[PDB]
Amino acid sequence: VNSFSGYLKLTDNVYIKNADIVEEAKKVKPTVVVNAANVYLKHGGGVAGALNKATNNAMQVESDDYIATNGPLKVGGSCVLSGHNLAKHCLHVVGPNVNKGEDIQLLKSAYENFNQHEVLLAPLLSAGIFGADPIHSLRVCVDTVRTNVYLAVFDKNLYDKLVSSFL
Ligand SMILES: OCC1(Nc2ncnc3[nH]ccc23)CCCC1
């Protein structure tokens, strides 16, 4: 039993809700919140910009030190950093950005990072400003993640479409 509330159950391990991931994180304080990161951990917009803003830019400061030490992530890769005031940990995961020409096949690799964590609050990878089809992202999530994932979909209209079209 955990403290996630109001989610629709999609499968044994995947749950979905129309919610602002920032507000969800502030309420639940999950062990792991997933950020929709880029390889530079530059948290400018989308989910990443919103999460970083909620940390008063502390996420960005930590991220800049991480990159200065380690260099960029790989598309499809991840790193674990602090969750600041939002969660114990933030798993920064890089899905392919279609608006950059990156290979959508890397979306499965990106979701594989979730399997290293027993429970996660997460957005749909490569959706929104990353330019992939969110219906496809949901399918890859369901077919790749085996741990317990609570998906926050910001856009209510998109949420309804994802539920109604889910196979
Ligand atoms: O889930 C993926 C999407 N992005 C967010 N989800 C949840 N909370 C969010 N807060 C800010 C952005 C954001 C991308 C397109 C629609 C939802």
The CATH number that applies at residue 23 is 3.40.220.10
Ligand 1 centroid to residue 151 C-alpha, Å:
9
Method of determination is X-ray
Taking only Cα atoms into account, the Rg of the chain, rounded to an integer number of angstroms, comes to: 15
Contacts of 162 (CB under 8 A, 6+ apart): 16, 134, 135, 138, 153
Nearest CA to ligand 1 atom 14: 128
Note the resolution in Å, 1 decimal: 1.0
In-domain check, residue 1:
no
Ligand 1 centroid to residue 68 C-alpha, Å:
28
- Which class for 71: exposed (0-12), middle (13-18), buried (19 or more C-beta within 10 A)? exposed
Nearest CA to ligand 1 atom 1: 123
- Which class for 112: exposed (0-12), middle (13-18), buried (19 or more C-beta within 10 A)? middle
Domain residue limits at 72: 8-163
In-domain check, residue 70:
yes
In-domain check, residue 116:
yes
In-domain check, residue 123:
yes
In-domain check, residue 3:
no
In-domain check, residue 82:
yes
Number of domains in the chain: 1
Q: Where are the alpha helices (DSSP H) in the chain?
A: 21-28, 46-54, 58-70, 106-112, 134-144, 156-164
**Adjacency order of strands within the sheet including 148-153:** 8-9, 14-18, 148-153, 119-122, 32-36, 89-93, 78-82
Give one DSSP letter per residue of 35-72, joined into a string: EE--TT----SHHHHHHHHHTTTHHHHHHHHHHHHH-P
In-domain check, residue 2:
no
Q: How far apart are CA 38 and CA 131, in angstroms?
A: 13
Amino acid present at 123: P
Q: How far apart are CA 137 and CA 123, in angstroms?
A: 10
Q: Determine the atom of ligand 1 nearest the C-alpha atom of 47.
A: 12
In-domain check, residue 78:
yes
Determine the 3-state secondary structure of 145 from DSSP: coil
Contacts of 56 (CB under 8 A, 6+ apart): none
